[PDB]
Design a protein around this nucleic acid. Structure first.
Length: 195
DNA sequence: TGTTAGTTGGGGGGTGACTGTTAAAAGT
DNA sequence: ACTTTTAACAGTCACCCCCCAACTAACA
C-alpha cells in the first residue's frame, strides 16, 4: 500500500552508471578488498576516462531522462487525490526520518552521553530475562504488570541504581559539553539543566 | 505547563558513513 | 540568480528504528 515504492525513480547520472558496472568487475578481481577502496579506484578510472567516453554515458543518461519525464507524468496523472496525499506524507516522513538519523549518527560519533535510566528502566533490565512471554513485547508486558504491583520498599534498589545513573549522566554531560565547547559547538549544549 | 523523545529488553529489517561524481532540487 | 544540498548506484560495517508500556530530562 505504498505509492512511493511504485513511483518511477530518476535515471542514474553518468559516473554512477559507470560505477554500477565497474564495481562487480573490481570486486571479482579484488575479492578481499573493501568496497571503500574499490570505489576510490573506480572514480580514478572515471577521472582518467577521456571526455569522449564519458559523453557516451551522458548521452544514455539524457535519453533516460526523457523516458523518466514521460513515466513520472503518466504516473502522477494516474494517481487519485488520496494517493497523491499518501505519497506526499510518505515523502515527508521519509525526509524527516533521514534527517533525524543523520543527527543521531552525528551525536553518536561525537560521543554524547546516553540520558539517565529511570528506576523503571533499571527494573526492566533486571527482570526482562526471567519474565514469561512468547516475545519481547509479551515479556515486556509481563514486567510492566509486575512493576505496577511493586511496593515502595521493593523498589528501593531500582531507585537507588537510577539515582546512581543520574550522577553518572550528570558527570558525563559535564565533560561532554565542555569538550563540545573546545570544538566550538556550544550549540549542542543544553539550554536548560536542573540540578 | 504541556510536549518531545530517548531510555529499558531482543530481534529482524532498515539505513547513514564510507569510498566516489553528477545534476536536479531546494535554499538563500 | 546563484550556491548548497541531496538523490541517484552498491558492498560492508556499524549502529538505528520499531513494537510493546512506563518514565522523565530537556524543550517550549
Amino acid at each position: 500500500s505504498s505509492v512511493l515504492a511504485s513511483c518511477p525513480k530518476k535515471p542514474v547520472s553518468s559516473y554512477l552508471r559507470f560505477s554500477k558496472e565497474q564495481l562487480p568487475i573490481f570486486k571479482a578481481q579484488n575479492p578481499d578488498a573493501k568496497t571503500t577502496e574499490l570505489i576510490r579506484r573506480i572514480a580514478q578510472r572515471w577521472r582518467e576516462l577521456p571526455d569522449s567516453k564519458k559523453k557516451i554515458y551522458q548521452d544514455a543518461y539524457r535519453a533516460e531522462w526523457q523516458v523518466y519525464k514521460e513515466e513520472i507524468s503518466r504516473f502522477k496523472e494516474q494517481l487519485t487525490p488520496s494517493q497523491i496525499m499518501s505519497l506526499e506524507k510518505e515523502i515527508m516522513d521519509k525526509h524527516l526520518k533521514r534527517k533525524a538519523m543523520t543527527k543521531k549518527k552525528e551525536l553518536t560519533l561525537l560521543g554524547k552521553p546516553k540520558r539517565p535510566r529511570s528506576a523503571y528502566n533499571v527494573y526492566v533490565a533486571e527482570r526482562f530475562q526471567e519474565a514469561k512471554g512468547d516475545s519481547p513485547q509479551e515479556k515486556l508486558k509481563t514486567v510492566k504488570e509486575n512493576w505496577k504491583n511493586l511496593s515502595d520498599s521493593e523498589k528501593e534498589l531500582y531507585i537507588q541504581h537510577a539515582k546512581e545513573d543520574e550522577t553518572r549522566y550528570h558527570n558525563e554531560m559535564k565533560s561532554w559539553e565542555e569538550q563540545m565547547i573546545e570544538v566550538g559547538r556550544k550549540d549542542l549544549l543544553r539550554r536548560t539543566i536542573k540540578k
